[PDB]
């Protein structure tokens, strides 16, 4: 029984999950935490939070093999799997690494600095310790590489997209892509004429549009701070605004890179918490800020949806997924209401529906346009991508 | 036979408009250019480009007043209507011009620096030249102060707005608010049981929905630079690409601002111009850069049209309208191409005809969505506002 072990590398932690070649069930799941940091622990399933002061990624890793060897599941990693954040225009699918995939994600890694160093150091930590192991690589900036030049684009001078990259990238994309795959089953569509909005909500948030199979504009930008509002960063904000603050109140650009990153969203307009569910109840019980920063969120939600509706030929459907998407029955009704210019009808029973009803149609029968909640599973896609890239002879 | 003098008093210029009370036709028009600077002129009708050197705004309108005398036309002057740039939170509708509204004005000055008070300056200077002449200022950003907070919120902490100010306000509400009352009749909709897009485009460009009368969503941010991308502004930009910028080429706000604002959007992607006239014939001629702002311009104007439409519950119509939406045959029809999936059909020989043709229905009638051209006129509009204000006893 061949199990594929799945690495997500991040600059503060590293989170795993041990997959099930023939199933795609998870086995085992994980998370190294508060990693370069003084107190550093590894909490398996969370079970019990074992400490492992002043450890580097090679370590935490390291550990987290050890508890693999411990339920004699080591002799049977026959594929690693690894999330990164980034893979510039040089990765439009997932791939075997080698010392050139290597190369090529560190070159491109200055588009995102932190988080793909932190993903190489994972790369380089599971070579060292499984070296006898296929290891593949699944970028969340893959999917998104059909988009046309008039799509990813800024109007920013030429010079900066020709000499130093700048242009969207779009992120989420193994959700997008795994959601999108999922819901040519569950709406009974032919992926080649096709047209789908996916709405990846989570403490990141974006939106996709997917035209006969193919992403053809999604809402993050160069990096994840544009698009949508989410739990802790404001999502689309004015330059001009962001400028003008600046000169009022003396604060720098990486002062407001962390203001507008780790201070927004939900978090800023609410002044409560990034938490959904603690502002649906905050809004239950008569809050006015939780209530605005959730209508915020929603309107933002429905102007980029049916913005992005706009790629599309013909809208069959939209796809509700992550945390929020998943589990706000509020959130996607308001949504949804917010797109009767679209011809949405919600069918409320099956929207009231908890996750734990899985892939489902959210829609009356009478709707222009179908709707449904398909959970993501991106462990799942990467062992898939993984699986299919097993049977290579490189 | 009275007269409405229309003033719009800009950073680097004045340029007027003298209307006929009962016909609202202009009677003679121009413009002091050149302002605050060693050589100023003022050309009127485009008949005599009469040197200026070294004048202020109060010279600079005392010249045209003298212009106005000589042609008989100072006795009949009944009404004077100024353009102002930002009316903050305070103003929701055109008024009469007093010591209160100079106040007022001065107050929400700081929103946008130099254009108040230049138009503030207009208003010294006319107050001088025309004291026992009713006066009126007509904001750009009343027409949107219909906005809800979800529409107008940005995601940052609470407290840029609630004590800095900053949220969206919208611009070119002069013009969305008269194009909007022509189409209900054009269209023959009950204004008041509604939805339309008003897409003005010219060198600036805004979207704007109107639901019920009532401006719902608009494009522009705080300032100008959001939304669409321009003849020379960015429009919508990831603000992780900004500050990943500066840190790459050691630029600052400032800096940026200046590059956001003057040097980006057609002009910056084509390397060519600002011009669409220029940039159609560019395309037309292979130049792929061109076709490439061109796709770009025509891309962000499409996605925000729909996004917009998402603030209606039905969608009636669109209307062009500005420099580009009047005169560009190609740019409105890749526009209206762009969004099929909201069932748009247009009729090419009636999209074909130049704006001679003036209030103009270009879809066919197969189209879910009448789409139409109407020209503009900002200063009409001002007048109107005036002559209504005319009868007011105050
Ligand atoms: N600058 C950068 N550049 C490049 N890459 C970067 C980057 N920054 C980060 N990345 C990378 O991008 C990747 C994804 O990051 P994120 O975008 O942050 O991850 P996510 O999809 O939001 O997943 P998460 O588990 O955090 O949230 P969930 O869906 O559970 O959803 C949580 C939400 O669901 C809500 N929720 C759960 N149950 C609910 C219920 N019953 N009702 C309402 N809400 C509910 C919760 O309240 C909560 O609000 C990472 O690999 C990361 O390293
Ligand atoms: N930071 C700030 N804060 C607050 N307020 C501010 C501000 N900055 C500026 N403002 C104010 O905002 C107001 C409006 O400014 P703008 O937004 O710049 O004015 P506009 O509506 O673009 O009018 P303009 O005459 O410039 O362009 P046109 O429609 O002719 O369209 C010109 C275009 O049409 C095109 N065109 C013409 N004929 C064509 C044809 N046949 N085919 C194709 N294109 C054609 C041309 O090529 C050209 O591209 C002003 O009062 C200004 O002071």
Known sequence: ???????????????????????????????????????????????????????????????????????????????????????????????????????????????????????????????????????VAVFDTSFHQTLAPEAYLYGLPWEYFSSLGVRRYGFHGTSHRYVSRRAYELLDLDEKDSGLIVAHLGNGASICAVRNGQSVDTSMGM???????????????????????????????????????????????????????????????????????????????????????????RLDGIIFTGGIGENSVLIRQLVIEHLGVLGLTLDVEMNKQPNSHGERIISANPSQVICAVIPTNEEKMIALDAIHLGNVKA
Chains 1, 2 share one sequence.
């Open 1 to 135: 029984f061949p199990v594929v072990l799945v690495i997500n590398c991040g600059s503060s932690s590293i989170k795993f999950s041990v997959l099930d070649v023939a199933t795609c069930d998870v086995l085992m799941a994980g998370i190294a935490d508060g990693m370069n940091t003084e107190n550093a622990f590894l909490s398996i399933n969370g079970d019990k939070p074992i400490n492992l002061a002043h450890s580097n990624y090679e370590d935490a890793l390291k550990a987290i093999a050890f508890e693999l060897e411990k339920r004699d599941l080591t002799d049977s990693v026959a594929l690693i799997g690894h999330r990164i954040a980034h893979g510039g225009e040089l990765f439009t699918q997932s791939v075997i690494i080698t010392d050139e995939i290597i190369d090529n994600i560190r070159r491109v890694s200055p588009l995102a600095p932190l988080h793909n160093y932190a993903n190489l150091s994972g790369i380089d930590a599971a070579r060292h310790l499984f070296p006898a192991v296929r290891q």
């Open 223 to 313: 990096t994840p701070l544009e698009g949508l509002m989410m739990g802790t960063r404001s999502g689309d904000v004015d330059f001009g605004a962001m400028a003008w603050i600046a000169k009022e109140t003396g604060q720098t650009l990486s002062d407001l890179e962390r203001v507008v990153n780790k201070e927004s969203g939900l978090l800023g307009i609410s002044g409560l918490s990034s938490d959904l569910r603690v502002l649906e109840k905050a809004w239950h019980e008569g809050h006015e800020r939780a209530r605005l920063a959730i209508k915020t969120f929603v309107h933002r939600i429905a102007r980029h949806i049916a913005g992005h509706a706009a790629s599309l030929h």
